[PDB]
Amino acid sequence: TRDQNGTWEMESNENFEGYMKALDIDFATRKIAVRLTQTLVIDQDGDNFKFKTTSTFRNADVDFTVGVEFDEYTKSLDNRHVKALVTWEGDVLVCVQKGEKENRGWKKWIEGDKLYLELTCGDQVCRQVFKKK
Amino acid sequence: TRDQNGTWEMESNENFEGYMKALDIDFATRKIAVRLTQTLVIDQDGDNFKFKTTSTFRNADVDFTVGVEFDEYTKSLDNRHVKALVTWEGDVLVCVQKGEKENRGWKKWIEGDKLYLELTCGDQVCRQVFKKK
Structure with a gap:
């Protein structure tokens, strides 16, 4: 055909x-x-x-449990080893990525149909907004 | 929540x-x-x-009519201007991309539920197979 x-x-x-x-x-x-x-x-x-x-491109899964620290290699990005700890601050999901870089982590929260994600490294902050599909 | x-x-x-x-x-x-x-x-x-x-990443659309040459800039790839001409050879869709690169083009055909795509440039051939979703 x-x-x-x-x-x-x-x-x-x-x-x-x-x-x-x-x-x-x-x-x-x-x-x-x-x-x-x-x-x-x-x-x-x-x-x-x-x-x-x-x-x-499909990135590697990340699996974790709130409150138990886990090792991460950031193959998606700079390919570094961090020790990541995720905790709740209210309804805000907060991750500290302990490693070479200072103030490395992220915060994630729902407001309405939008998911807000704030990535931090050093003095830089990257703000992403997602829509529920 | x-x-x-x-x-x-x-x-x-x-x-x-x-x-x-x-x-x-x-x-x-x-x-x-x-x-x-x-x-x-x-x-x-x-x-x-x-x-x-x-x-x-979404690439730019390409629109063309079989048999009428059209200009292309390959922003997706090497960002060059080619003059592309698409014709049928049987059920094989054949494109010659006239430009700086010799033997630049592609061929596309259906066999079963698979779409076959052969890209060529110089002496290099890249073969891609797609599945109908």
């Missing part, structure tokens, strides 16, 4: 590294791109095509 | 650049990470938590 309509989820991706290198994509980009999976939405009407591509 | 169960889709992300820099994440990674959106699946049973995070 010529009908390529649909949502397509990447199963395999061989020699993406060599293709990207032949395009002169730089090392640090290739290092990340080779880890992604791709979803392709093809909307086809006769010979008219619309391609919609999203690229995706 | 202390109930943070759910699937959460990132709405906003402020000062992620400063947080990542304070963690000494390198430039080329920060350049890409600041473009991602995050989906957080929180599975909470009492004080036991499972966090499942996927990070996501």
Whole structure:
């Protein structure tokens, strides 16, 4: 069939590294791109095509119990070992990540249909808002 | 509420650049990470938590009609201008991307529930297989 309509989820991706290198994509980009999976939405009407591509990476799960310290390696980010302790302050979930970096941690809380997340390291604060889907 | 169960889709992300820099994440990674959106699946049973995070980037749409050449800038990849021409060879969708790079293009075809995609540049070939979802 010529009908390529649909949502397509990447199963395999061989020699993406060599293709990207032949395009002169730089090392640090290739290092990340080779880890992604791709979803392709093809909307086809006769010979008219619309391609919609999203690229995706799954991070490692994190499992913990409130009140019991656990070891973390932040492979997702700086790949450091921290000793993380999560506690409740009211309805605010508070994590201190004990390690090399000062004042490293986060706070998480629900307000309405929004989840608020405040990441901290040193004097820097990053504020993220999520919507319940 | 202390109930943070759910699937959460990132709405906003402020000062992620400063947080990542304070963690000494390198430039080329920060350049890409600041473009991602995050989906957080929180599975909470009492004080036991499972966090499942996927990070996501939406690429630009590509719209074309079989048989009419169109201009492309490959912002997704090497950010080059090519003149792309898509034609059918049987049920195989064939694209030649005319530009600086020799033998640059791709071929796409359905076999069963699988979509096959072959990207080419120079002497390099990248083979991707997608599953219909």
